[PDB]
Amino acid sequence: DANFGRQISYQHAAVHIPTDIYEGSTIVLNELNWTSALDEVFKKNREEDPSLLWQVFGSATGLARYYPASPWVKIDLYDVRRRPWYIQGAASP
Amino acid sequence: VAIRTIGNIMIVTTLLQFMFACIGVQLFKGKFYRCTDEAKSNPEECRGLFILYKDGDVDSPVVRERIWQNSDFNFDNVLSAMMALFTVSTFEGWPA
Numbered sequence A: 001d002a003n004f005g006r007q008i009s010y011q012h013a014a015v016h017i018p019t020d021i022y023e024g025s026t027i028v029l030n031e032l033n034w035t036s037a038l039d040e041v042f043k044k045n046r047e048e049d050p051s052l053l054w055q056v057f058g059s060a061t062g063l064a065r066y067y068p069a070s071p072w073v074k075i076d077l078y079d080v081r082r083r084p085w086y087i088q089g090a091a092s093p
Numbered sequence B: 001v002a003i004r005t006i007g008n009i010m011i012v013t014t015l016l017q018f019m020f021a022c023i024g025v026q027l028f029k030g031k032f033y034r035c036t037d038e039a040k041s042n043p044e045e046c047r048g049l050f051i052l053y054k055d056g057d058v059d060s061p062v063v064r065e066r067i068w069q070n071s072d073f074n075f076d077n078v079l080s081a082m083m084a085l086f087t088v089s090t091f092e093g094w095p096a
């Protein structure tokens, strides 16, 4: 797609889980249901405004679910809870 | 001829080792488990992958799999305890 330097898909939303966090655990899997209902709203927001960039949910468990789905970009050390946009919204100065 | 003469002290040092093996079984029966990374302390968390830092450097990370594995010389049963106690009595690797 244009206006997106990668290959993307609007059918669903991708899920990023950091290397040091094991997928399939009880906490992650429970977190992995109720975030699946966000895909409908992810589609709805894009329909109203086609010129919309990444919409991402940074969970307190560690996993980040973003839309539209796109494969992730050495080893991976990305953690959604350490990003500048997560930190400013999780507390005050 | 000498073997049969030293057979009285062999029956004693073998019987005495068995009691210590049973005591060791009572004490450390399944307590010698550990994960690959020293951050997870039970089999539930010791799953998946983890980031290992070579030789303590925080700038050289490598991805490794964490496995909940037993010790080589454990006290799970009376035989592993007897073998570990034999290795200790040979004074080899006993500090570990």
Ligand SMILES: *[C@@H]1O[C@H](CO)[C@@H](O[C@@H]2O[C@H](CO)[C@@H](O[C@@H]3O[C@H](CO)[C@@H](O)[C@H](O)[C@H]3NC(C)=O)[C@H](O)[C@H]2NC(C)=O)[C@H](O)[C@H]1NC(C)=O
Binding pocket: A033, A034, A036, A037
């Ligand atoms: C967490 O994951 C669960 C397993 O995937 C979900 O539970 C199942 O969701 C299905 C999809 O809605 C349900 O199927 C239908 O549900 C409707 C509504 O009650 C009913 O018509 C029937 O129960 C069912 N239809 C059938 C079977 O033809 C399942 O009933 C439901 N429960 C199961 C499989 O035990 C959860 O929805 C999901 N949680 C969230 C928040 O998404």
